[PDB]
Amino acid sequence: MQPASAKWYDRRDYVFIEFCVEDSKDVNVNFEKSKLTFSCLGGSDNFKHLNEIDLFHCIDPNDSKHKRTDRSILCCLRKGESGQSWPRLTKERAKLNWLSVDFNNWKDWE
Amino acid sequence: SPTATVAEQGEDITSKKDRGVLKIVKRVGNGEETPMIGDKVYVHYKGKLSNGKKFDSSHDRNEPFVFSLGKGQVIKAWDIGVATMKKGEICHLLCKPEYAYGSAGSLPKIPSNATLFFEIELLDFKGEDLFEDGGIIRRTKRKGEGYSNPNEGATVEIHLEGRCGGRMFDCRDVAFTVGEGEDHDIPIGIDKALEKMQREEQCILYLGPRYGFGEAGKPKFGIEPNAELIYEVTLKSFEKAKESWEMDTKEKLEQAAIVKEKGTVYFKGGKYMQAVIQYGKIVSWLEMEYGLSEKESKASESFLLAAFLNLAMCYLKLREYTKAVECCDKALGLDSANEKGLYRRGEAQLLMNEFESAKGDFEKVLEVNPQNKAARLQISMCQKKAKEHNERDRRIYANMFKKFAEQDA
Amino acid sequence: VETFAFQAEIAQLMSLIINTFYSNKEIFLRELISNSSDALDKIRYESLTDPSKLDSGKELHINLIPNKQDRTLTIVDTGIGMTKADLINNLGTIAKSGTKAFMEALQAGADISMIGQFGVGFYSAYLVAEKVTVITKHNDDEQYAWESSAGGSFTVRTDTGEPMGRGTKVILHLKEDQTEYLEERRIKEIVKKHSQFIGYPITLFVEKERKEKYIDQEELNKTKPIWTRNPDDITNEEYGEFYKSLTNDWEDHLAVKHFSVEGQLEFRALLFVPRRAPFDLFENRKKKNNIKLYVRRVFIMDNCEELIPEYLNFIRGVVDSEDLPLNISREMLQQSKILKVIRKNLVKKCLELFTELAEDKENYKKFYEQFSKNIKLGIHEDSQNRKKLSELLRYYTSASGDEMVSLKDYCTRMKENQKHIYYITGETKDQVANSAFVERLRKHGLEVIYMIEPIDEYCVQQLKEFEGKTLVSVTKEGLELPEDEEEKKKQEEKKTKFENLCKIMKDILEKKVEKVVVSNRLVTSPCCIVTSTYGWTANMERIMKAQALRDNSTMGYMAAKKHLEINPDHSIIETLRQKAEADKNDKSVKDLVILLYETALLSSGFSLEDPQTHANRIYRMIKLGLGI
Amino acid sequence: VETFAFQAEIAQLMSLIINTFYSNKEIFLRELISNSSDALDKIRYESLTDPSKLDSGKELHINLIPNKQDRTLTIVDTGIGMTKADLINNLGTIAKSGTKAFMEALQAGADISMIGQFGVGFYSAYLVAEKVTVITKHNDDEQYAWESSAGGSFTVRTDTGEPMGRGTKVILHLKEDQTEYLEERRIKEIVKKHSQFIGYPITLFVEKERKEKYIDQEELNKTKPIWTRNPDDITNEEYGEFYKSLTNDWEDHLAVKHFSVEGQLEFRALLFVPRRAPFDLFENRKKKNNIKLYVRRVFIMDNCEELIPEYLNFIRGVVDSEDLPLNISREMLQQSKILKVIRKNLVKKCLELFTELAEDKENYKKFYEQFSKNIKLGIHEDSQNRKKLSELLRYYTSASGDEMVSLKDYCTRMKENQKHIYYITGETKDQVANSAFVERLRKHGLEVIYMIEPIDEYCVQQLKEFEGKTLVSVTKEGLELPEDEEEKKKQEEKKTKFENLCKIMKDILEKKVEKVVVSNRLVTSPCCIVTSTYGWTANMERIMKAQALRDNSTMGYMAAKKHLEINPDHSIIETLRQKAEADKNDKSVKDLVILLYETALLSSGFSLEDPQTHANRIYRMIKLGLGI
Ligand SMILES: Nc1ncnc2c1ncn2[C@@H]1O[C@H](COP(=O)(O)OP(=O)(O)NP(=O)(O)O)[C@@H](O)[C@H]1O
Ligand SMILES: Nc1ncnc2c1ncn2[C@@H]1O[C@H](COP(=O)(O)OP(=O)(O)NP(=O)(O)O)[C@@H](O)[C@H]1O
């Protein structure tokens, strides 16, 4: 129905995305070489979220993972090339209003 | 609350006696003189305002605020508060709105028609040196009207009261042509100070010895050649010696053709300061010029150069060899290859014993004119001076380290 | 097992938002202006696809009305307003924010970006208010008044008063001790400080004339955030009118850098070199730095020593960002590792600004005359940029006609037999240019750099090399001149014929010098004091002996060892040789050698350990000169 | 009119407490230790009136237990613990404070204090924790576990694990990158920084010996907050052991104050004067001061430039208070007025400390030989205290030898005809003591204060007067010595005799001096260069010309108006009079008058405008003196 609010950051090997869906249900994540897709039901009201993220650079589905908690869903995406800096999460220069950098754990690792 | 107290108490120090500026004196200062128009004056101030805010302070920087009376600094009550304090005097000072700023306000926090209030101490003052060479000091009792002043060639009407070493001897009005004054019963210092005086200006002038009645003196009053004097002047009215915006160079050049001859008659008459005043008025009249044609500029620079060549001789005859060389420095600025200007400079420097600089211009006289016998003779005199000075020094200093080693006992 | 939602104790939670979040009360005005800037942006956005949303009013603006007699400050806008539902939600619920909920609904192509997101900022009104009334009118509902004293409850009523058409009117009934926020001076200060770049006109309704019945100051933000525009479109006149608006300066800017960083940070900045150095630029320990940080055009902080290094503190400038993490107070930035990534970019782009300014030589002179201290302080404090900063240096030299040249101009003129850049230091250009140490350099035709500020002596400690050429002082021991073998042999012969005198002079001068040696550096001076390489030069020692707060204990070992050099061809020295070969212990040799040492201390720019014992020698020469 | 209670959006409110309140994550261990110190105080208080409350456990302690395998930091606490209703209330309700509720339920005479009051501190665990479990038992209830990810919900259940006896066991399951908070170096830092003074044993249990199955780091807080005791209870060895514990110095404090401030702002402080000045004391521009502020024994901030002025930066100390208003992060105060009223008392009692220390001469010498820069810097900056700081000054003088004496001792020795305190300034005590300026002061038996450090030249700008006696520099014009009417007459007769020489010398020295004058400060020197009353002294000009980061044009406006003073009794000057009268232009008089001036600049502490032009005169006299 609407993208979930998301916070994001990276390290030399991984790009991390936290979808801030408290008491989330029916969480599904699909990893593909050039794209992430995420969907769930919101814990307060069963509102269905859907985020499609056509990624800035390639990733490895064979080493990417996700985890659900009573507070949030975290996705860890394995970079297709370690040491690639990501200036944005998506291939496009789209200003996705629900998405921002997670400055609780962002660091200039490069 | 000293700043609140001065709102209704103190001596009225206003020129108007209007109660606009009052002082509460807590320590009366030294000397009966309090500052005059044109004095440089140094005062500690701390300040407060009718809105309860701070003004500005010299006390906070541990260095006085500096004032020039009749032109002022920043507050008319500070100019009045300066003009009426003795040295080391401590007081509280009032400033009513008309003596503050009127409607204008001020920075940082002074409103329109504010009253201002201060805690203050006067440190020191100095008179106006008219040249920055101790020649004349002037302190002013009343500022006059005008942008242009009766320099040499003016006709003026003045009140003049005159003192010899402090002894008063004359008290009267005199009318005169400026730059002739021994012929009019007036010292050279009045002929020079009037170049800076305005209409109905009133002042005291202290005249150095080179500013007395020249080589003539005034024996009627018991006064010697080149006496040191003190004067009261009021400049009542004048036919101004026209500036470079007020008149052309041609009028000053026809006057220079007459005046250079008068200077020559005074020089040959042994009146070397009257000659300095003739050549020196041409130097005032033509070096002020601007906006000339090339032919007008050549005439202007030619009568400057001829005046500097004869100023050089007059200052050589006066033994004022620094003033002879300051004239030759400008004759060589007007033409760097002038023969008499190169020579006279050599003389002024060699008579000042600086022979290395003197030969350095006589050797250029011998580029302009190889047949100039005087430049050849004066180069030999530069080398005689050098050889005699170094032999003299050798006669004095030789073996001093042996003498000191022998004396140490 | 049992599962529970969290609760919140509203009576304490409100008391935290009032008493503990915000350290300065004055921010309430920036919060209510930011809420009005959000409310205007919402309606300005929604009108883009439906002009009829503005039927209820078309002037998008803010007005402040300090009513002194009702002890009340009103803040009003023509923004979107609130429905009855939006009141009871967004003002009734702490940490709920209609601004966030609006932005989560938008597509990426939306031009809007709003200030609010925490759902707390409105409650800051109770810093100054006893009670707050929010009158409001949306398009799709009636006019309502919401009102509360923050006492655990609020009331909403249909409002029968003055029809607003569309907008909001926040009325703050101030506390008796908070009436200063009714003073138009104070209001001007707070709005100008916190919020002068809000994209909508903030009008302050002042007072009766003396007559205009109630004079309104038209716009407290009588400016624009020009940094938001494309740097290719802005002309230097527009940058100049902004620089004056930003700083209250009357003068223009000297040079300006305008740029954006695109990445995990996104930010834009204007960095201005001012036409003149501030009179207090290094003295003002309170105004440490001159960069302001904004987020979405609202002011965050300024005097942060982390934003740029101290040597760049002269730059007047603005940083603005879309998505940085703000502390709950919004009075500061949260993640301090962001200040490092800002600092790296601000510094990188300043050295591009100076590098492009250095192509415009005539302006570069106007810069360097005033900010040479900053470049040289950069060589001292900043080891990463020291390479780039060295190419910004300009100096007088012996081969420069009273004009300043770079180390790259020196490298263009160097003789191919050199492997060094020779420099000298001292108190004035005439003191160094006449100085004994350059005499041989001038004879060989070798260029000498003159470094003559006290800051130059700190700079050259770090600046050991340029372009693979060693920067070597002419005031230190064993100066390597590009001699030829004929001269090298003459120096070995001259060291041979004087070695007896060198021992004799070292015995006379002992502990006042470390040694006495024959000189490859003088022509016409008889002797000069140089120093050992590992310590403070003659210039550095006089500077360190004048640093008022420096510990004396380092001066006792960093002060370098004085070496006397002797010119082998000076007639005083050949005579002193003929004296010393006659008698080692001669009282005339003893007093002459200590006089040459004292004259060499003065000529070399040291002070004497006692000037009076030297003056008593000259007063004895003068007693002879006068014939006493 | 419709009335509503306020609400909160829990999902956003929890996210503020995690994201926006606390800028540094390390405080999570301060908060969980504080909530444990409050739980320990609660059970200790219940034990005072009924000891049976401790029958389930008598030891009061906090154990940190890192576990690198499970990735958990545990924090065990043998405090009161929580009933099921207290878990659901005080961990379940945001901004509810069970500590505040307990503290308000006590009688006002209760001899207790507690750190908690905001009811949010526990949630800071989610800075580092991915999930939290709290296991707890009370005396009046069973053992329960509470557990949550801060997911807007939490679970409570009867745990029936291993028995707690009574207390709390917080287990923090740390996030995949927050594992540095398991490192024993990290924990030792955070606890010694924030919570070192908590009134209970904080033990750390880490890894193993490699032998015990864990390193029992038996305390992290071996010290006790000695400042809470009465100043009569404590001996100087206990203050010394505390000062070493506070600072890791190996020496005892030199002197100590122990305060007891009462009123609105009630606080206690320990201020220690170090045994020696820190090597970096003024050079470490990051460390503004060495005072730590505590509230209820928990650290609030250090290095706050508002606590004490930078001239007192050397004082290592603790300030502690019960009642100060904290910001929501607890890392700062809300009000700057609290720092003003602290600082007034800190400074007022420091100047009492130095005043009590100044009676103990041998300890005062150990203080002043290191911290004299701080007193002198104090008199420059601190306009309120100059009247007291000047009684702390100690200096060398012309009648004390190598001893240091106070201005009170100078005013004890003054001759009854002095109205002034004579002082001189320069690079060394021997330069000033053997200077030309002091000669008649030394002949009249008038004492001169010697001022030697570059900081003294700042001090005497502000120190204009002491006990109604004006401080006058003996290097400045118009030196009013006490002298007899016969001497005043002879001085005016000598000014009359030498008026030609003075005018002739001014014409040779033109623009190098403002005057040439006959004077009374000299006896044996022929002349000296004396500055005007309102210029820099010769020493001040040397100091200002060496300040690397000051605008030389802007400060140089008051560079010295040099006067040449002439000694009328000197045989050089009496002979030079005769020569100058005989021929004004004599090349001998033109050379010797400039050589007297250039010698007088040196004896008077200036540098020459060019030392090489001077040195060439000396080398010419040496050539002539050797017959070259
Ligand atoms: N003037 C106004 N016009 C329209 N809506 C408003 C206005 N003032 C407040 N609101 C609404 O009230 C909500 C909560 O306001 P507020 O407490 O100020 O926090 P916030 O601005 O939303 N976020 P923040 O400023 O970061 O605390 C806003 O998001 C709007 O929905
Ligand atoms: N270890 C513990 N033992 C007993 N009670 C505890 C413990 N930890 C927390 N509590 C209770 O939980 C309440 C709320 O805790 P908390 O959220 O940490 O805030 P606070 O300590 O009360 N006040 P503050 O530290 O200023 O934020 C406390 O007041 C106690 O009643």
Short mmCIF file of N, CA and C in Angstrom, two decimals, chain C residues 241 262 345 380 424:
data_model
loop_
_atom_site.label_atom_id
_atom_site.label_comp_id
_atom_site.label_asym_id
_atom_site.label_seq_id
_atom_site.Cartn_x
_atom_site.Cartn_y
_atom_site.Cartn_z
N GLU C 241 25.75 40.88 -2.41
CA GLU C 241 24.56 41.32 -1.65
C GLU C 241 24.17 40.33 -0.55
N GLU C 262 27.71 15.25 -2.60
CA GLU C 262 26.65 14.27 -2.86
C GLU C 262 27.07 12.87 -2.39
N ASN C 345 35.70 18.11 3.61
CA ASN C 345 35.21 18.75 2.39
C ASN C 345 35.35 20.27 2.42
N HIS C 380 51.87 25.10 9.88
CA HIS C 380 52.15 24.65 11.24
C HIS C 380 51.20 23.54 11.71
N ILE C 424 66.41 33.10 4.88
CA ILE C 424 66.87 33.81 6.06
C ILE C 424 65.67 34.31 6.82
#
